[PDB]
């Protein structure tokens, strides 16, 4: 029953080296299987990196001169990724992976030099009038670094009818938006409130949607 | 590198009919211990890849039997008898017999479903953020088919080619619609000089194009 779990950061500076870890469980890595990491590029497009080898041996893909680096912890049933001198090409989400069909859930890496940076959080209230029974309330979550930001509403017991798009770069930060489409008869009658979470600033906003 | 191409790029399919996805190696995948080490697998949207053929034509046992690969030395497909709502994702190839092992790019298989009307909605600047000196007018365009869609802005009947931003939801799994997000970014001191904003969607379900406005003014 093999599973295969990446950790390490969100955020490098571009120059510097990133690390990862893969925890394996219920299959020694010293038992068989060559582990590898691979990565996906925005755009979709994959390339393997590199491997370490039950035996300890390791392998790696000449496209990343010496600057790649895997090693193990035997004990821990762990192997690492290393990559060294990165750039703004390194930017990607980074799987662990094995044979038979066997691939970590993955782990998103940014490399910008760019700060962490906490979000701003407008509402999108509507101009002034339609007849309709149901209607449309936002929320812009604007120039926040690095990703991701969640957004719920009223604490998520507003799931139903949300769409929160993909962030956007914008001015070197990202801008996202969310919207819910809620009975007018509930709105402005009830209160809705968008909840904005940023982990990498520690930061929580919650913005109430106020009529005009 | 061993060069994988997949063809075609992009597909749309509907529920229950079937599909073919082929893929061509820039050399025989055939290794010297007679093995020919190719793959494909699927990635729905936001999860991880799943094998779902090795060996060319070996089905992996977690994958139902839908699945088929054939193919020799270069040329490799994948078909598909008949598609399901929970075949919407990228496919790509994959061989492991030259070094380094190389992907194909992928193929975006998308679900076909009716054509639907986006409910499209324009929001104004908040006051918050005029404060900061910006101004971000918004408009969601939500739950349309196909994908395909024009959005124009006007501010006082003239077109706004600039500071426009967009962002698209994958498909959705629940209906095979689609949602967008666009917004127009100004000054607070350019916004505060015009009076009518507008969104405009060119669709495919309306003969003329969607529009939602409003007017500063109040
Ligand atoms: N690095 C890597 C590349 C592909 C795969 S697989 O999921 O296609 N499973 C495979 N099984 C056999 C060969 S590949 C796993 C790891
Ligand atoms: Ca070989």
């Known amino acids: 029953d093999v599973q295969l779990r990446e950790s390490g950061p969100d955020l490098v500076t571009p120059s510097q080296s990133l690390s990862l870890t893969c925890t394996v469980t219920g299959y020694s890595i010293t038992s068989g299987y060559s582990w590898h990491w691979n990565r996906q590029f925005p755009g979709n497009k994959l390339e393997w990196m590199g491997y370490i080898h039950y035996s300890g041996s390791t392998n790696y893909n000449p496209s990343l001169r010496g600057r790649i680096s895997i090693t193990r912890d035997t004990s821990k049933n762990q192997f690492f990724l290393q990559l060294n001198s990165v750039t703004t090409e390194d930017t990607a989400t980074y799987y662990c992976?094995?044979?038979?069909?066997?691939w970590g859930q993955g782990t998103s890496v940014t490399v910008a030099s760019a700060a962490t940076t906490p979000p701003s959080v407008y509402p999108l209230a509507p101009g002034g009038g339609a007849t309709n029974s149901m209607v449309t309330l936002g929320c812009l979550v604007k120039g926040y670094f690095p990703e991701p930001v969640t957004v719920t509403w009223n604490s998520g017991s507003l799931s139903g009818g949300v769409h929160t798009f993909p962030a956007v770069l914008q001015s070197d930060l990202y801008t996202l938006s969310s919207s819910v489409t809620v009975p007018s008869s509930t709105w402005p009658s009830e209160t809705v409130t968008c909840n904005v979470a940023h982990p990498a600033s520690s930061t929580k906003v919650d913005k109430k949607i106020v009529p005009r | 590198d061993v060069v994988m191409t997949q063809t075609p790029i992009t597909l749309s399919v509907t529920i229950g009919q079937p599909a073919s996805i082929s893929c061509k190696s820039s050399?025989?995948?055939?290794?010297?211990?007679?093995?020919?080490?190719l793959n494909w697998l699927l990635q729905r949207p936001g999860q991880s890849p799943k094998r779902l053929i090795y060996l060319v034509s070996k089905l992996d046992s977690r994958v139902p039997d839908r699945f088929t690969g054939s193919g020799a030395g270069t040329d490799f497909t994948l078909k598909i008898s008949r598609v399901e709502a929970e075949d919407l994702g990228i496919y790509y190839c994959?061989?492991?017999?030259?070094?380094?092992?190389?992907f194909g790019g992928g193929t975006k298989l998308e679900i076909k479903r009716a054509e639907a009307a986006p409910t499209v909605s324009i929001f104004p600047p908040s006051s918050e953020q005029l404060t900061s000196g910006g101004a971000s007018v918004v408009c969601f365009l939500n739950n349309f088919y196909p994908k395909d869609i024009n959005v124009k802005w006007k501010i006082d009947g003239s077109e706004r080619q600039n500071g426009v931003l967009n962002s698209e939801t994958d498909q959705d799994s629940k209906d095979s619609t689609y949602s967008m997000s666009s917004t127009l970014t100004l000054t607070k001191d350019e916004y505060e000089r015009h009076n009518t904003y507008t969104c405009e969607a060119t669709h495919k379900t309306s003969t003329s194009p969607i529009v939602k406005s409003f007017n500063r003014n109040e």
């Open positions: 050399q025989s995948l055939l290794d010297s211990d007679g093995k020919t080490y």
């Open positions: 994959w061989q492991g017999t030259h070094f380094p092992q190389t």
């Open positions: 992976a094995r044979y038979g069909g066997y």
